[PDB]
Enzyme design. Structure first.
Site, PDB file in Angstrom:
ATOM      1  CG  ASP A  29      -1.768  -1.099   1.470  1.00 54.38           C
ATOM      2  OD1 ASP A  29      -1.926  -1.992   0.604  1.00 54.38           O
ATOM      3  OD2 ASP A  29      -2.415  -1.214   2.557  1.00 54.38           O
ATOM      4  CG  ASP A  69      13.626  -7.270  22.449  1.00 50.54           C
ATOM      5  OD1 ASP A  69      13.891  -8.409  22.923  1.00 50.54           O
ATOM      6  OD2 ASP A  69      14.413  -6.312  22.587  1.00 50.54           O
ATOM      7  CG  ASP A  85      -1.042 -15.014  15.117  1.00 49.23           C
ATOM      8  OD1 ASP A  85      -2.103 -15.177  14.490  1.00 49.23           O
ATOM      9  OD2 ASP A  85      -0.630 -13.843  15.378  1.00 49.23           O
ATOM     10  CB  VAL A 135      -9.279  -7.094  13.788  1.00 52.97           C
ATOM     11  CG1 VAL A 135      -7.837  -7.192  14.224  1.00 52.97           C
ATOM     12  CG2 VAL A 135     -10.168  -7.554  14.919  1.00 52.97           C
ATOM     13  CG  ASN A 157       4.682 -13.160  24.882  1.00 52.17           C
ATOM     14  OD1 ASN A 157       5.086 -14.313  25.134  1.00 52.17           O
ATOM     15  ND2 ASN A 157       3.417 -12.790  25.076  1.00 52.17           N
ATOM     16  CG  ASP A 175      -6.283  -7.306   8.323  1.00 46.84           C
ATOM     17  OD1 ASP A 175      -5.904  -7.798   7.238  1.00 46.84           O
ATOM     18  OD2 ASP A 175      -7.445  -7.456   8.721  1.00 46.84           O
ATOM     19  CG  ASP A 176      -0.975  -5.371   3.636  1.00 48.33           C
ATOM     20  OD1 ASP A 176      -1.483  -4.247   3.340  1.00 48.33           O
ATOM     21  OD2 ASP A 176       0.225  -5.567   3.403  1.00 48.33           O
ATOM     22  CD  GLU A 182      -8.192  -3.336   7.773  1.00 46.60           C
ATOM     23  OE1 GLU A 182      -9.057  -2.653   7.127  1.00 46.60           O
ATOM     24  OE2 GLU A 182      -8.473  -4.398   8.356  1.00 46.60           O
ATOM     25  CG  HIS A 217      -3.807   1.266  19.738  1.00 45.30           C
ATOM     26  ND1 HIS A 217      -4.690   1.818  20.657  1.00 45.30           N
ATOM     27  CD2 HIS A 217      -4.069  -0.071  19.702  1.00 45.30           C
ATOM     28  CE1 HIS A 217      -5.444   0.851  21.146  1.00 45.30           C
ATOM     29  NE2 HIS A 217      -5.084  -0.310  20.582  1.00 45.30           N
ATOM     30  CD  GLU A 218      -2.424  -2.897  17.423  1.00 44.02           C
ATOM     31  OE1 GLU A 218      -2.285  -3.757  18.330  1.00 44.02           O
ATOM     32  OE2 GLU A 218      -3.571  -2.634  16.952  1.00 44.02           O
ATOM     33  CG  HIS A 239      -1.966  -3.385  22.766  1.00 40.19           C
ATOM     34  ND1 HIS A 239      -2.638  -3.013  23.912  1.00 40.19           N
ATOM     35  CD2 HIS A 239      -2.838  -3.211  21.741  1.00 40.19           C
ATOM     36  CE1 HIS A 239      -3.868  -2.654  23.598  1.00 40.19           C
ATOM     37  NE2 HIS A 239      -4.023  -2.792  22.292  1.00 40.19           N
ATOM     38  CG  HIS A 248      -7.937  -1.714  24.723  1.00 38.67           C
ATOM     39  ND1 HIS A 248      -8.480  -2.868  24.188  1.00 38.67           N
ATOM     40  CD2 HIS A 248      -7.087  -1.216  23.791  1.00 38.67           C
ATOM     41  CE1 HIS A 248      -7.966  -3.052  22.975  1.00 38.67           C
ATOM     42  NE2 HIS A 248      -7.140  -2.055  22.706  1.00 38.67           N
TER      43      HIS A 248
HETATM   44 CA   LIG Z   1      -3.410  -3.413   2.144  1.00 40.19          CA
HETATM   45 CA   LIG Z   2       8.945 -10.839  20.302  1.00 30.75          CA
HETATM   46 CA   LIG Z   3      -9.356  -6.291   9.261  1.00 30.91          CA
HETATM   47 ZN   LIG Z   4      -1.036 -12.205  14.323  1.00 33.59          ZN
HETATM   48 ZN   LIG Z   5      -5.706  -2.116  21.221  1.00 37.16          ZN
END
Ligand SMILES: [Ca+2]
Ligand SMILES: [Ca+2]
Ligand SMILES: [Ca+2]
Ligand SMILES: [Zn+2]
Ligand SMILES: [Zn+2]
Length: 162
Positions: free
Chosen positions: A25, A59, A71, A81, A93, A99-100, A102, A119-120, A123, A129
């Site tokens: 993209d 990491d 996964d 999502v 971890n 998500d491509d 998007e 945001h990610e 996490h 959240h």
């Molecule tokens: Ca895409």
């Molecule tokens: Ca890792």
């Molecule tokens: Ca999605």
């Molecule tokens: Zn995943």
């Molecule tokens: Zn989140």
């Protein structure tokens, strides 16, 4: 703000990241820029520092994926999502998957990569959240600023900058 149960946090201050693949993209430099900016958001308000790897296990491994991708949490096609990331720890971890299905954009015409990566990475660093609607960690550009709630939460884990 909220943390994860058991408060998993990185036990070291210097973290590595690796951009494993690239979306169709965007130009590759727009992906790199959005990731760097996303990391800086958190670096600015903690003692955490980051460096990039091009081989081996960093990491925070960052990648784009579609539907099933290695996964237990397949992405879901367009919308809904947008991405997901794992709490601190070894192996999967800390890793962040985008998500491509998007349309990742540099601006707000599609899904903004920088905002979602910021945001990610929250996490990946151990924040869950927030209940504050203005927080970056609430489930949902020239006006962007990390909220005090986000700072309070990330500093509860890692302290303020030295
Ligand atoms: Ca895409
Ligand atoms: Ca890792
Ligand atoms: Ca999605
Ligand atoms: Zn995943
Ligand atoms: Zn989140």
């Amino acid at each position: 703000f909220r943390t994860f149960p058991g408060i998993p946090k990185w036990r070291k201050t210097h973290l590595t990241y690796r951009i494993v693949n690239y979306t169709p993209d965007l130009p590759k430099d727009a992906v790199d820029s959005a990731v760097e900016k996303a990391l800086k958001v958190w670096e600015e308000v903690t003692p955490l520092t980051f460096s990039r790897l091009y081989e081996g296990e960093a990491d925070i491994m960052i990648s784009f994926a579609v539907r099933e991708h290695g996964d237990f949490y397949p992405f879901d096609g367009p919308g809904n999502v947008l991405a997901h990331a794992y709490a601190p720890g070894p192996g999967i971890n800390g890793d962040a998957h985008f998500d491509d299905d998007e349309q990742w954009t540099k601006d707000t015409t599609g899904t903004n990569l920088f905002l979602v990566a910021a945001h990610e990475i929250g996490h990946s660093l151990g924040l869950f959240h927030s209940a504050n609607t203005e927080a970056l960690m609430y489930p949902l550009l020239t006006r962007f600023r990390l909220s005090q709630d986000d700072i309070n939460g990330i500093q509860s884990l890692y302290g303020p900058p030295p």
